[PDB]
Structures are given as C-alpha cells and as structure tokens.
C-alpha cells in the first residue's frame, strides 16, 4: 500500500511526415560516372553537384563498382537523407593505388597527388576501366606526381611542373643528373596484370544535417500537418514531435535551430520557407495510488 511514481505521460505519434525540397532533375550520373575523359590524379577534377535527386539505383543498369566505401554515413541510409555541399572528385590511378584513396593512408598517391582529410565525410567509388583507358602499345596520357618536397594537405591540388632537385647540385630549370620532371606517365596496356590496370575513381564529399541542402534522396514528400504528434523527416533529419508555427526568424544560411541541450527545436520547412517549432509529445509526471494488492 502506498503511492508510486511511474513513467511520464507518453503520446505516441499518429502519422509519418516527409518534407524534402522541390527537386525535379536527376543528378548527372552519366556525366560523372560515364564521362568520356577522366582527369589525371595530379590534376584531379572537382565538380559541384546541386539541385538534383540522388537516385543512385539508375547506376545498376550500366555501372559495376569494385570499391564502394562510405565514411560518415551508412550506405543503407543514403536514400533517406539530403546532402549539403556535394562535390565529385574524379581521376584515374592504377589498381594497386585504390587502397590509398582513404583517410590516413600513405604512399605516393596519398602523399603527392590526392589526400583525404582525417574527418572525411562521403563515399569513395572505384571501378576497373581497362577497356576504356588501355590501348595496344600503351596509353601514356595519364600522369602522376612522383617527386615532391613535402606531403600534400587534404583536398589540395598541385599542378606545378618545376624540376625536382633530387641531389645536391641545383637544376636551374633543366633536366639532368638528379634533376627530374616531377610528373611521370602511367603505362596502361590491356595485357597488364590487375594492379597495373587503370581504375576510374569518383570521390563524393558532402555535409549532413547541419545546413540547407539541395541534393536529396528519392523520397516522396507528404503534406505538412501541425499541432499533432508525428514522426517527421526534414531534409534527412528524422525525429518525433509536435510541429507548431514559430516566431523565430532564421538567417538565410540557417536550416535548423538548437536549444541549450543541443536538440533540434526549430526547423525551416524546405518547400514553404516557414519556421516550425519542434516540441516533444511526452510530458507530465504520473503517480499511481494503491492499497495492497492483497487488499484490492
């Protein structure tokens, strides 16, 4: 017999709401993964991706990837998210150097040509391209930097062609003994073993759930319901709560608002650019009063 504290009063959500921006076009998968020409790794090309639907299942018909590794995000969550500041980096390397396209790697590619940051968020995609980038007699149009005085910084590009001084005597801008051109050509032949066959590499980099996004997964948006406990999905940011109209005025670069506990309590709706407060459904202490269960 007595009074006992129980759980706080819980309200279950009644429906699920998805709010993604108005985006019609598909992302240039043909331009990125089916380009005729690919850059060299020393002069790797960076392409901005914006205002498109990242429906990667269109690559299932044409593309086959030997490497697909994502870092800040699970692969099965990519369809449910929206992506901020998307860039695609494209180059060609030999097969033995695909393992060097990862954070914290050493080797001549990761030191002198293309370096990923330690806190890298995105995905690394590589596939064999022997039938496109090899030819009889050798293809020598793809270059790499063999010599450099120091390691590259993350996402840094070095396209200089100054003569490297590998000895004590100065070079004075000409080649000679211990004075080498810093860029050397790959030799790509179709009869090469794998490891010296060319591999096309696409590195995607993006930010998640901190900023306005314009590249989104192929999720359909529902209607916006207010004043009810719902499961929401705002540009990939999921959660449960009650959405009401807000008096907050966001700056144009802001998508989410946070409180002192660092929880998202305000959001800008991506279709109608209004600010919505997010409030949890469950609230209020509950106590139960009983006599003994042997009594009643």
């Amino acid at each position: 017999k007595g009074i006992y504290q129980t759980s706080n009063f819980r309200v279950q959500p009644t429906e699920s709401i998805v709010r993604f921006p108005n985006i019609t076009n598909l992302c240039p998968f043909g331009e990125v993964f089916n380009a005729t020409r690919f850059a060299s790794v020393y002069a790797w090309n960076r392409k901005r991706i914006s205002n498109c639907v990242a429906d990667y299942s269109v690559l299932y018909n044409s593309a086959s990837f030997s490497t697909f590794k994502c870092y800040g995000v699970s692969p099965t969550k990519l369809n449910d998210l929206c992506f901020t500041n998307v860039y695609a980096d494209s180059f060609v390397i030999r097969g033995d150097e695909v393992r060097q396209i990862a954070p914290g790697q050493t080797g001549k590619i990761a030191d002198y040509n293309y370096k990923l940051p330690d806190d890298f968020t995105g995905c690394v995609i590589a596939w064999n391209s022997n039938n496109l980038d090899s030819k009889v007699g050798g293809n020598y149009n793809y270059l790499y930097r063999l010599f450099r005085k120091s390691n590259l910084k993350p996402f840094e590009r070095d396209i200089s062609t100054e003569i490297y001084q590998a000895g004590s005597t100065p070079c004075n801008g000409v080649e000679g003994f211990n004075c080498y051109f810093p860029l050397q050509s790959y030799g790509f032949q179709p009869t090469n073993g794998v490891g010296y066959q060319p591999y096309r590499v696409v590195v995607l980099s993006f930010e998640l759930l901190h900023a306005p996004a314009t590249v989104c997964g192929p999720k359909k948006s529902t209607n916006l319901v207010k004043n009810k406990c719902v499961n929401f999905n705002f540009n990939g940011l999921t959660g449960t709560g009650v959405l009401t109209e807000s008096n907050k005025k966001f700056l144009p670069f802001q998508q989410f608002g946070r409180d002192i506990a660092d929880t998202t309590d305000a959001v800008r709706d991506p279709q109608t650019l209004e600010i919505l407060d997010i409030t949890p459904c469950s609230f209020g202490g509950v106590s139960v009063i009983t006599p003994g269960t042997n009594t009643s």
Partner: peptide, 14 residues
C-alpha cells in the same frame, strides 16, 4: 611515346 626513354614523363622507361 610522348618522350624518349629517360626524359620527360618517361623517366622510368627501361
């Protein structure tokens, strides 16, 4: 070849 062996981007050519 874009260069002769030992010169240019063909330094490693044997």
């Amino acid at each position: 070849c874009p260069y002769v062996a030992g010169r240019x981007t063909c330094l490693x050519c044997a």
